[PDB]
Ligand binder design. Sequence first.
Ligand SMILES: C[S@@+](CC[C@H](N)C(=O)[O-])C[C@H]1O[C@@H](n2cnc3c(N)ncnc32)[C@H](O)[C@@H]1O
Length: 424
Amino acid sequence: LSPAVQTFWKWLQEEGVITAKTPVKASVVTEGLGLVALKDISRNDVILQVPKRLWINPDAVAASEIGRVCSELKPWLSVILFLIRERSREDSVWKHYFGILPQETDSTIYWSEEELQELQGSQLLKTTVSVKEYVKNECLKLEQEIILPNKRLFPDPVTLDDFFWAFGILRSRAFSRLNLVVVPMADLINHSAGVTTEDHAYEVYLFSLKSPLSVKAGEQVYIQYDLNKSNAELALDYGFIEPNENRHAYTLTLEISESDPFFDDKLDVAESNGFAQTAYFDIFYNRTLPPGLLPYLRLVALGGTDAFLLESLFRDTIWGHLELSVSRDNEELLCKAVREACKSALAGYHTTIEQDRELKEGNLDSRLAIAVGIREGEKMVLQQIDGIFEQKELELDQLEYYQERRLKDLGLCGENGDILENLY
Ligand SMILES: C[S@@+](CC[C@H](N)C(=O)[O-])C[C@H]1O[C@@H](n2cnc3c(N)ncnc32)[C@H](O)[C@@H]1O
């Protein structure tokens, strides 16, 4: 199989973790290293368990030499350091484990500059940059506020690579369904679209991993890393994406600009209804628009004419009105805004959707494959969004705005009330 692997398997045997009782062995798979069943495994059948003596979470670090200095650092920042540190120490408990970890994955955080060019204009790139940058800054501070000031605790130098490595290890290996825990044995299980349950991680302590599917002997055991992540999200978190178009999403960022002459009132309406000065709306392919997006768009586009809706008089129905549409100029404005944003965004890519689809038809490198897939999907969402609002522009007169809704109760054709009035 492999040196480090064979050595790693041994290490788990003597640690009492794995035994000749476990129905699975390590194997080289297209997804790297994975867990191949040694015998017909059944649904919900536990395949392996690990002693909390082997975790690597905010509970292992704090109980370590650097626990004191990291006591004030965010949980992840704390674990990254612990990971890097334990990596160096040629005696650490995670010696053989670290020997197995990949130097890299296909997460966009490791992509070269050429590789990233393949994501030109893509939201995924904007996001990966932000995340890389932010992690960078955050990690430098830890070098000058904890790494250097404590040269006793952090011997060997800590390169920016070491950071991204550890950060990567967190994003693609840590289990969040329980925090951030790392489990040497259950770190090898891979992801599959075949698993549609997402009920595997569980501890009795002891981390117990149960196979959500019946895997016949020889086959690989899988799990569902997350039924809710977009492809953009899997691309950055792990090094892969799915062909499932239902994973393509594009998030829109709305906000009530402070320069808005009705900023104070608008923000008041937004917060009274669960929305901040800045709100993010994730838009998934083939899914209906997220609730609140339209009403918020209408709020953003409001305008002097319909500003009367911001008066204390409607501070109990204003949101309902926002949901039912304000006025034609309001709707026309917001549609114009969204449509221009889509066109502008779409124009930011360096390939046409046809080109991407043709590319997908050949053999693509894992990273190029991710870029192509991601960018095509984003374009599908950008175009679907734009299509939705294009239609809306056409139906711009089918909506019954505020003024109309207000007169839908005049009772012009009632009784000859004057008769009754002249009766006193
Ligand atoms: C939790 S680790 C899995 C263990 C990994 N296979 C190894 O060799 O150690 C997750 C990483 O494995 C790979 N992986 C897992 N599921 C995959 C899939 N369905 N397709 C491609 N790569 C996958 C990715 O690089 C991902 O970031």
